[PDB]
Amino acid sequence: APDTSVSNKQNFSTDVIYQIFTDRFSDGNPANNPTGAAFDGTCTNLRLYCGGDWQGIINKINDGYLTGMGVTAIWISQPVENIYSIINYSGVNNTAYHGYWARDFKKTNPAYGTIADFQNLIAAAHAKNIKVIIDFAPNHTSPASSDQPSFAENGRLYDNGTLLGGYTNDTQNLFHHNLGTDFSTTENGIYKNLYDLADLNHNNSTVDVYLKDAIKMWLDLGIDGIRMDAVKHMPFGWQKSFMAAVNNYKPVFTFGEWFLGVNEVSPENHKFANESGMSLLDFRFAQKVRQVFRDNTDNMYGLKAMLEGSAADYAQVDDQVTFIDNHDMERFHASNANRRKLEQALAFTLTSRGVPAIYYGTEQYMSGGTDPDNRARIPSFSTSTTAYQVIQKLAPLRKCNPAIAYGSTQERWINNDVLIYERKFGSNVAVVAVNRNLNAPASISGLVTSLPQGSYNDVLGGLLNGNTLSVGSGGAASNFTLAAGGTAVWQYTAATATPTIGHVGPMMAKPGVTITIDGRGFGSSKGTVYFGTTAVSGADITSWEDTQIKVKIPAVAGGNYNIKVANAAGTASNVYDNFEVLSGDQVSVRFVVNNATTALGQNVYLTGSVSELGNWDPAKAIGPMYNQVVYQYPNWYYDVSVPAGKTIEFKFLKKQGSTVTWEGGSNHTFTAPSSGTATINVNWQP
Numbered sequence: 026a027p028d029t030s031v032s033n034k035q036n037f038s039t040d041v042i043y044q045i046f047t048d049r050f051s052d053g054n055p056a057n058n059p060t061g062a063a064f065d066g067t068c069t070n071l072r073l074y075c076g077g078d079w080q081g082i083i084n085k086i087n088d089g090y091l092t093g094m095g096v097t098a099i100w101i102s103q104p105v106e107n108i109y110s111i112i113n114y115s116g117v118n119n120t121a122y123h124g125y126w127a128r129d130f131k132k133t134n135p136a137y138g139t140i141a142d143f144q145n146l147i148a149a150a151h152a153k154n155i156k157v158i159i160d161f162a163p164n165h166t167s168p169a170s171s172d173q174p175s176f177a178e179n180g181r182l183y184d185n186g187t188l189l190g191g192y193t194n195d196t197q198n199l200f201h202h203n204l205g206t207d208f209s210t211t212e213n214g215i216y217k218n219l220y221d222l223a224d225l226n227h228n229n230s231t232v233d234v235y236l237k238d239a240i241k242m243w244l245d246l247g248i249d250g251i252r253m254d255a256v257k258h259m260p261f262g263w264q265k266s267f268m269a270a271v272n273n274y275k276p277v278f279t280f281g282e283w284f285l286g287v288n289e290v291s292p293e294n295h296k297f298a299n300e301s302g303m304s305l306l307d308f309r310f311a312q313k314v315r316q317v318f319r320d321n322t323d324n325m326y327g328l329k330a331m332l333e334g335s336a337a338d339y340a341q342v343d344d345q346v347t348f349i350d351n352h353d354m355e356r357f358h359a360s361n362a363n364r365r366k367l368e369q370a371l372a373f374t375l376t377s378r379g380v381p382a383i384y385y386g387t388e389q390y391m392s393g394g395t396d397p398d399n400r401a402r403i404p405s406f407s408t409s410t411t412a413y414q415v416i417q418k419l420a421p422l423r424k425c426n427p428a429i430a431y432g433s434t435q436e437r438w439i440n441n442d443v444l445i446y447e448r449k450f451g452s453n454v455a456v457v458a459v460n461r462n463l464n465a466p467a468s469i470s471g472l473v474t475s476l477p478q479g480s481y482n483d484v485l486g487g488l489l490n491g492n493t494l495s496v497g498s499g500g501a502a503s504n505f506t507l508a509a510g511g512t513a514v515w516q517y518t519a520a521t522a523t524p525t526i527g528h529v530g531p532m533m534a535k536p537g538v539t540i541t542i543d544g545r546g547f548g549s550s551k552g553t554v555y556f557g558t559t560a561v562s563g564a565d566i567t568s569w570e571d572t573q574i575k576v577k578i579p580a581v582a583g584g585n586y587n588i589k590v591a592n593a594a595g596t597a598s599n600v601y602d603n604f605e606v607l608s609g610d611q612v613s614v615r616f617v618v619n620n621a622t623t624a625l626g627q628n629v630y631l632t633g634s635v636s637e638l639g640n641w642d643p644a645k646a647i648g649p650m651y652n653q654v655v656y657q658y659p660n661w662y663y664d665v666s667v668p669a670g671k672t673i674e675f676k677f678l679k680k681q682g683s684t685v686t687w688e689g690g691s692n693h694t695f696t697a698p699s700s701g702t703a704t705i706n707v708n709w710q711p
């Protein structure tokens with residue numbers, strides 16, 4: 026199958042995601058609607074259940090609302106059963122309409138539908154070439170009070186009907202009891218409760234195995250992707266083991282939410298996206314787009330800096346999920362704002378690198394402040410809005426023009442208000458011109474592109490006041506006027522002679538697992554696939570066609586490899602680096618080192634005899650370790666994904682910058698468990 030197939034669960038770069046708040050989209054089955062104080066059919070009280078369900082989504086999939094818009098993927102509310110309690114916060118009732126208060130990850134939320142309804146949703150979506158991404162929030166269960174056991178449902182967790190335990194009298198330690206986080210540090214935000222939500226303890230074997238079995242169930246139901254909730258609030262090491270469990274079973278595109286504010290560039294965020302096994306929602310992109318197109322707090326130079334910086338900071342920038350707003354931000358469109366701003370931000374996002382996500386109702390110009398005002402019921406299913414037509418025209422390009430899906434990004438023209446960028450992949454090109462200035466036109470002269478000689482019609486058809494482009498030799502475009510608020514898209518597609526890799530997924534798995542290499546020019550006959558210097562051909566290449574290759578990871582030592590391919594003729598492609606071959610199945614193990622004193626600025630790290638521990642290379646050491654919540658300095662701890670059942674040798678390091686001080690004596694040693702978790706506690710050796 027081609028890279029653009031709906032069956033491609035490893036690549037969403039050619040897709041356009043539509044984020045659906047199930048309850049606020051369409052109530053297709055009134056029979057499953059909650060009742061009493063937990064329901065408001067009018068959806069005036071945005072804190073109660075409005076009735077939106079999976080049958081409603083099925084209806085909108087079948088009546089052409091999404092397909093006519095060019096949507097090829099949906100991201101829905103967490104499908105698992107949530108608490109039924111109606112929580113009263115300051116005299117205001119609240120329900121789990123949002124799906125983030127799980128009580129059983131192995132059952133469905135009755136309000137959305139039954140297992141059968143979910144299956145019909147998967148079937149209906151795939152029948153229309155629409156992939157399905159589910160929200161998954163394994164950080165917590167639901168609101169609970171240690172002082173008030175009767176509050177809500179005490180965060181009780183069930184395993185397919187069987188009660189495992191609650192927040193009160195948690196003798197099993199299924200949850201964290203370190204109070205609440207003040208977001209002062211990453212560690213503080215991870216090992217303490219997020220607000221009043223019962224924080225799950227992933228170091229507890231029962232919780233570890235349970236959550237991993239739970240995701241398996243949803244994978245078996247046919248989901249095509251996973252949106253991980255609050256990934257900045259769970260042990261990064263455990264999440265890696267979680268992604269390994271997913272990829273070593275049935276790999277599907279996964280991206281987590283790591284909120285970033287305006288002007289916030291986070292190195293930890295980058296590292297997480299590059300090493301966890303999942304990508305992230307591109308808040309850096311979203312915030313900058315809002316600054317430039319919505320709030321006027323930065324110009325096109327800032328937009329360019331974001332594009333160039335992100336392309337360098339993210340190993341796989343094309344896996345980052347972009348957007349202009351979501352359920353945790355005020356609606357992009359302000360009630361009194363010119364609609365062209367939203368239209369431009371949409372056009373920009375739909376043609377930029379990554380995986381575009383459109384928050385439901387954006388195409389209907391919905392306005393609203395912070396939660397819950399940004400989660401109103403979609404007012405209309407009109408296909409006559411300008412925004413709907415913009416999506417309709419640009420969304421399909423991610424499918425037909427690989428430059429949009431996998432291409433590099435280069436600035437071709439720029440000033441305070443104008444940005445003309447070019448996307449390029451092989452013999453495919455796309456040039457987008459955007460003039461955010463709603464009152465002043467711009468004279469575009471000296472524009473040079475990679476577009477072949479000829480005339481180009483604006484893909485938007487002048488919908489956003491775009492214009493035709495005339496290109497001479499050398500890719501030089503004739504002078505033209507870019508209208509105020511003008512937005513135009515010019516493109517060219519053609520066959521690519523040389524093998525070109527545009528995407529690889531998953532990017533982390535053990536030998537034997539099948540990976541998907543997408544691009545152009547691979548040819549029809551099986552060629553060769555390279556993992557570092559190791560060549561793979563024949564049988565282990567399950568399938569091979571011009572845009573997609575399915576190949577099994579060779580039995581090579583765990584580590585980081587560069588992926589490259591060659592057609593039957595032997596012509597090599599570009600290299601797609603940063604692929605992590607695991608040393609085997611993964612288990613989350615907590616390492617604790619006692620009495621490791623340090624100076625301010627100096628931190629303790631973990632190094633070991635397996636790639637998961639960086640193979641004794643201080644540069645790839647695990648950490649910096651923590652020393653405040655679960656254990657206190659001079660004791661340090663950290664949760665790490667390591668190969669199950671392997672005997673591993675390790676040592677700790679004290680690092681200040683890149684300067685390292687090795688622990689003395691002989692290496693420590695232990696054998697990781699075959700499944701579940703474990704805690705290895707040793708003393709720092711002088």
Ligand SMILES: OC[C@H]1O[C@@H](O[C@H]2[C@H](O)[C@@H](O)[C@@H](O[C@H]3[C@H](O)[C@@H](O)[C@@H](O[C@H]4[C@H](O)[C@@H](O)[C@@H](O)O[C@@H]4CO)O[C@@H]3CO)O[C@@H]2CO)[C@H](O)[C@@H](O)[C@@H]1O
Nearest residue numbers: 123125162208219220254255257282284285286352353396
């Ligand atoms: O009951 C609590 C609350 O839960 C909400 O459900 C989740 C939400 O849908 C999901 O996006 C996420 O949102 C939280 C972020 O994960 C978390 O990091 C935090 O974000 C703050 C940053 O940490 C700060 O650095 C700074 O940027 O400010 C950010 C504020 O957004 O808080 C987010 C909001 O909770 O996790 C939520 C919890 O599971 C429900 O949607 C909501 O109705 C509930 O009230």
Ligand SMILES: OC[C@H]1O[C@H](O[C@H]2[C@H](O)[C@@H](O)[C@@H](O[C@H]3[C@H](O)[C@@H](O)[C@H](O)O[C@@H]3CO)O[C@@H]2CO)[C@H](O)[C@@H](O)[C@@H]1O
Nearest residue numbers: 634640641642674675676686687688689690691692693
């Ligand atoms: O590089 C692979 C080896 O990495 C680890 O070895 C560490 C030692 O654990 C650490 O004590 C330190 O050894 C130095 C030693 O203390 C000093 O007297 C000598 O002059 O230099 C040694 C280093 O050259 O650093 C090494 C890493 O260089 C690991 O313990 C070992 O099993 C690996 O083979």
Ligand SMILES: OC[C@H]1O[C@H](O[C@H]2[C@H](O)[C@@H](O)[C@@H](O)O[C@@H]2CO)[C@H](O)[C@@H](O)[C@@H]1O
Nearest residue numbers: 436437438439440441469470471472473
């Ligand atoms: O002509 C090559 C040149 O084109 C662009 O330069 C623009 C510039 O961005 C505008 O602000 C204005 O000054 O007109 C110039 C063209 O005459 C590219 O930005 C530049 O890198 C490139 O060399």
Ligand SMILES: OC[C@H]1O[C@H](O[C@H]2[C@H](O)[C@@H](O)[C@@H](O)O[C@@H]2CO)[C@H](O)[C@@H](O)[C@@H]1O
Nearest residue numbers: 622623624625626627628651652653658
């Ligand atoms: O907790 C984070 C913090 O840990 C280390 O700080 C130590 C410090 O080095 C000790 O001398 C002593 O003051 O205890 C501190 C922890 O409470 C790291 O050195 C520091 O960089 C880091 O932020």
Ligand SMILES: OC[C@H]1O[C@H](O)[C@H](O)[C@@H](O)[C@@H]1O
Nearest residue numbers: 286287312315316319320355
């Ligand atoms: O300041 C809080 C928020 O205000 C507005 O919603 C901006 O669009 C957004 O970028 C910012 O994060």
Ligand SMILES: [Ca+2]
Nearest residue numbers: 054058076078
């Ligand atoms: Ca319903």
Ligand SMILES: [Ca+2]
Nearest residue numbers: 215224258259
């Ligand atoms: Ca947590």
